[PDB]
Design a protein around this ligand. Structure first.
Ligand SMILES: [Ca+2]
Ligand SMILES: [Ca+2]
Ligand SMILES: [Ca+2]
Length: 422
């Protein structure tokens, strides 16, 4: 359909070649698009070691030439895009345009030659201060002088360059740190200008807070429902999927301009290990919830192979390799497919039998998704607009029935179910 209407696979740290080789499986998994990690030239710290723990170097730009030791060359990037188009899957590039590396010496002359190119590296002091948040340095990373139209064309040239290479959209890293046109005496035309390209879909990483200004950003790009991420995760921890907690996106921005997730590479990879505790079953349930929804765009996070249950980096693989096979898990795919065929259809959330451990989403009268966070099997019996018949769970074993407007059958413990007519 369209990137916005489908699901995105976050091929976190997958190399271009790795991505190119899994394009058919990616497509058969049900994703409309994939999101790469930064594709520009970065500081390859720790002598370029590929240990997963070094994942953060991909966020310290040194030059805006395409290519780096972690994901491959620009040539391989173009091949990857091409391979994706053969199966109709779109490519979204993680763009780190708010800052560069903190290592001044590592920064290429290419950018240093741009006079008045940076706001400096004076680390933010007040996270409630929009001026400080957007005009100063994040963690010491030199801040681009985005008001300077010369840096604008330089960065926009990179974006257009990637578009030409096959990229179909962008994910703006630390978008919240680039000022908006209406940010008073320190605002600029950075966003109206750089978002003005042939890109099909673009959203910014906007970690919600008192100074995030979500809705303002929503006028130029889609935005991340980070708070909703906390609700989902929290619901998964307590194994309580009460529709009284997980049906509100916790944002002033409406779902049609929202990019959702169960977790983000940041909540997983950082030393805080905020979402690292979850298991694959937690993910399936979490995915069944957010990806059954309408309007919003789910972003599936491909964890390092073997990672999970508190463990960020097991050591099985390294930067460049593919993540766990969870991205093509029967349960996950079934939901991906659901999401796609249900586009347009409205949604109706609820908890069957008043049991808060059972989640049920009803898309129009075409489909139904069930999630049971509980550890005990449950006999569902509830209202549905599905025509009468015998539906087999596409997410796994089992079957369900609909007799005179009532959905009945069994939803096993810690399981997901996807129902709809062939
Ligand atoms: Ca900034
Ligand atoms: Ca393309
Ligand atoms: Ca750990």
């Amino acid at each position: 359909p369209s990137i916005k209407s489908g699901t995105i696979l976050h091929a976190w740290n997958w190399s271009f070649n790795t991505l190119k080789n899994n394009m058919k499986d990616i497509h058969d998994a049900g994703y409309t698009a994939i999101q790469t990690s930064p594709i520009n030239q970065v500081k390859e710290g720790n002598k370029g070691d590929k240990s997963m723990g070094n994942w953060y170097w991909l966020y310290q730009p040194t030059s805006y030439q395409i290519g780096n030791r972690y994901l491959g060359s620009e040539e391989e990037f173009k091949e990857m895009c091409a391979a994706a188009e053969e199966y109709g899957v779109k490519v979204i590039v993680d763009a780190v345009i708010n800052h560069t590396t903190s290592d001044y010496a590592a920064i290429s002359n290419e950018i240093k030659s741009i006079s008045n190119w940076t706001h400096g590296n004076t680390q933010i002091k007040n996270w409630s201060d929009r001026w400080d948040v957007t005009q100063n340095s994040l963690l010491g990373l030199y801040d681009w002088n985005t008001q300077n139209t010369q840096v604008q064309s330089y960065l926009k040239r990179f974006l257009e360059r990637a578009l030409n290479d096959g990229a179909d959209g962008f994910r703006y890293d630390a978008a919240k740190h680039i000022e908006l046109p209406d940010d008073g005496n320190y605002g600029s035309q950075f966003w109206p200008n750089i978002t003005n390209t042939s890109a099909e879909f673009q959203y910014g990483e906007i970690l919600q807070d008192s100074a995030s200004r979500d809705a303002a950003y929503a006028n130029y790009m889609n935005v991340t429902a980070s708070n909703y991420g906390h609700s989902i995760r929290s619901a998964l921890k307590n194994r309580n999927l009460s529709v009284s907690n997980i049906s509100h996106y916790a944002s002033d921005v409406s779902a049609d301009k929202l990019v959702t997730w169960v977790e983000s590479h940041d909540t997983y990879a950082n030393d805080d290990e905020e979402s690292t505790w979850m298991s694959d079953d937690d993910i399936r349930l979490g995915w069944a919830v957010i990806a059954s929804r309408s309007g919003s765009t789910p972003l599936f996070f491909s964890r390092p192979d073997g990672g999970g249950n508190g463990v960020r980096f097991p050591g099985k693989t390294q930067i460049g390799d593919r993540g766990s096979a969870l991205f093509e898990d029967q349960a996950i795919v079934a939901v991906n497919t659901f999401h796609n065929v249900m586009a347009g259809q409205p949604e109706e959330l609820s908890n069957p039998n008043g049991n808060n451990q059972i989640f049920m989403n009803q898309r129009g009268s075409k489909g139904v998704v069930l999630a049971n966070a509980g550890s005990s099997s449950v006999s569902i019996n509830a209202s549905t607009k599905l025509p009468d018949g015998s539906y087999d769970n596409k997410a796994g074993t089992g079957s369900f029935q609909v007799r005179d407007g009532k959905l009945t059958g069994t939803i096993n413990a810690r399981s997901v179910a996807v129902l709809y007519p062939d």
